[PDB]
Amino acid sequence: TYNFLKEQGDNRIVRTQALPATRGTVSDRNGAVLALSAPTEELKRHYPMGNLFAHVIGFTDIDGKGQEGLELSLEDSLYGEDGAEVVLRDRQGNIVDSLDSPRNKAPQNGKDIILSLDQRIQTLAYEELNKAVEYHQAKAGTVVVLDARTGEILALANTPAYDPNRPGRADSEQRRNRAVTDMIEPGSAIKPFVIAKALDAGKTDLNERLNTQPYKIGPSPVRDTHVYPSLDVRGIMQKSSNVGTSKLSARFGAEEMYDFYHELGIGVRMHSGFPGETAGLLRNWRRWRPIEQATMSFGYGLQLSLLQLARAYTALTHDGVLLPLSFEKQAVAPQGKRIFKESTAREVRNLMVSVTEPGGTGTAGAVDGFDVGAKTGTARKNKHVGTFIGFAPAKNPRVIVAVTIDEPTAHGYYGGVVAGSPFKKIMGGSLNILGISPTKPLT
Numbered sequence: 001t002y003n004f005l006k007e008q009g010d011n012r013i014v015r016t017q018a019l020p021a022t023r024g025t026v027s028d029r030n031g032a033v034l035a036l037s038a039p040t041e042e043l044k045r046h047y048p049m050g051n052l053f054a055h056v057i058g059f060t061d062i063d064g065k066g067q068e069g070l071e072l073s074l075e076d077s078l079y080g081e082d083g084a085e086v087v088l089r090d091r092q093g094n095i096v097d098s099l100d101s102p103r104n105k106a107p108q109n110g111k112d113i114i115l116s117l118d119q120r121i122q123t124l125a126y127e128e129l130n131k132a133v134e135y136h137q138a139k140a141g142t143v144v145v146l147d148a149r150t151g152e153i154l155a156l157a158n159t160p161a162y163d164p165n166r167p168g169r170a171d172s173e174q175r176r177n178r179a180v181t182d183m184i185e186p187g188s189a190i191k192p193f194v195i196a197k198a199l200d201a202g203k204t205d206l207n208e209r210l211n212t213q214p215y216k217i218g219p220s221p222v223r224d225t226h227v228y229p230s231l232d233v234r235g236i237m238q239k240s241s242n243v244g245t246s247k248l249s250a251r252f253g254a255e256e257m258y259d260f261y262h263e264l265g266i267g268v269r270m271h272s273g274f275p276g277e278t279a280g281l282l283r284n285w286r287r288w289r290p291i292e293q294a295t296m297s298f299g300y301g302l303q304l305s306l307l308q309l310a311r312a313y314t315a316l317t318h319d320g321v322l323l324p325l326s327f328e329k330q331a332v333a334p335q336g337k338r339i340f341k342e343s344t345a346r347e348v349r350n351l352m353v354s355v356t357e358p359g360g361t362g363t364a365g366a367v368d369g370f371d372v373g374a375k376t377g378t379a380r381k382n383k384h385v386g387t388f389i390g391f392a393p394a395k396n397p398r399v400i401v402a403v404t405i406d407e408p409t410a411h412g413y414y415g416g417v418v419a420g421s422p423f424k425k426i427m428g429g430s431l432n433i434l435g436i437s438p439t440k441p442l443t
Helices: 050-057 069-073 075-079 119-135 187-200 233-239 242-249 254-263 290-297 306-312 342-355 420-433
Strands: 013-019 033-039 043-046 066-068 083-089 095-098 140-147 153-159 209-211 215-217 220-222 230-232 373-380 384-392 399-406
Touching: 033 050, 050 069, 050 119, 050 153, 066 069, 066 075, 069 075, 119 140, 119 153, 119 399, 119 420, 140 306, 140 420, 187 233, 187 242, 187 290, 187 342, 187 373, 187 384, 209 242, 215 290, 220 242, 220 290, 230 233, 233 242, 233 342, 242 290, 254 290, 306 384, 306 399, 342 373, 384 420, 399 420
Parallel strands: none
Antiparallel strands: 013 083, 033 043, 083 095, 140 153, 140 399, 209 230, 215 220, 373 384, 384 399
């Protein structure tokens, strides 16, 4: 009797055998392989580049289902469809016959994805980030680099990280994708937008001189670090004047300001495609006092993730049009949402260059051969969080770099010193990597 016609016994056992799909591969924008599957001694996931892209890509569970990062969120297109076949086997595991069955199915492999991220920029961001964190004895740190013209993410790293090839020994603090999951107070980093809105609506202009003496809203004082009797809009930007900023904001009602912050993306989920997105914090305007509106104008009382912060800056770099962010490689810039006039964005960019020049509050982030528009700040959580964010070449921007250092312990606290050195190295490096020439003679 032919073996397939027989009753089963100890040595002929009907068995449905899985034919596993192979999971899609993840590559960087130039083709470098970041994630792939190999047959195991079932498939196994390999991350050839180790902890470099840990938080972005995330990892997979023992059954090859996405568990964190883009492995989780792209799980549907990445997994494929396992196949199967019915076989007779012997008690030693040898396939003895292949049986006809409507259950015999070929596997469908997963879709490959090409990220927008650039291994060279990721490496530079990764290196400079850890140098800063280790030097300042900080708790943690985050970097985001964007294409100022397309919204494509070029790099995104956080420290501490973990090896995604060995995710089972990774701490909760290690696994957290801070750029995406963590709310911060922007502090001075919001001021450019307040100024731009005032300019865009015509509530101020480039000639107006504001009285910027410290004042009080009821009992609560509003003051700068130094007394400046009067500043124009350029000086308000340059000196990072709380007084000037809150006065310009106070020329708008609470609802108008709220709708503005909201349309920049504050208080809602980005829906970027990453899992674990924070919604941030924007309190309903109906609950606002004048003091709260004013403190928001200099970046307290409202919160967003560093990735939200960096995205807001696309309104400034992409000629007043706010872009959605991309983790996948784009052929062209996506349609955005117009927020400012092109005319307004150009002048505000011009103003921000003054922050990084001798008279400004963030000279630590100046880059040889380039005009850099930037803001810098430090918010309390004592324990602090230093931020530095900016773009270059300021007239025709190409890159946005955002950096936060969390609880620096040694060699300062201020974000300009602390988050300013890595910002400068990462920005300079990135401009070099992208082959952008200097616009002014090098020192």
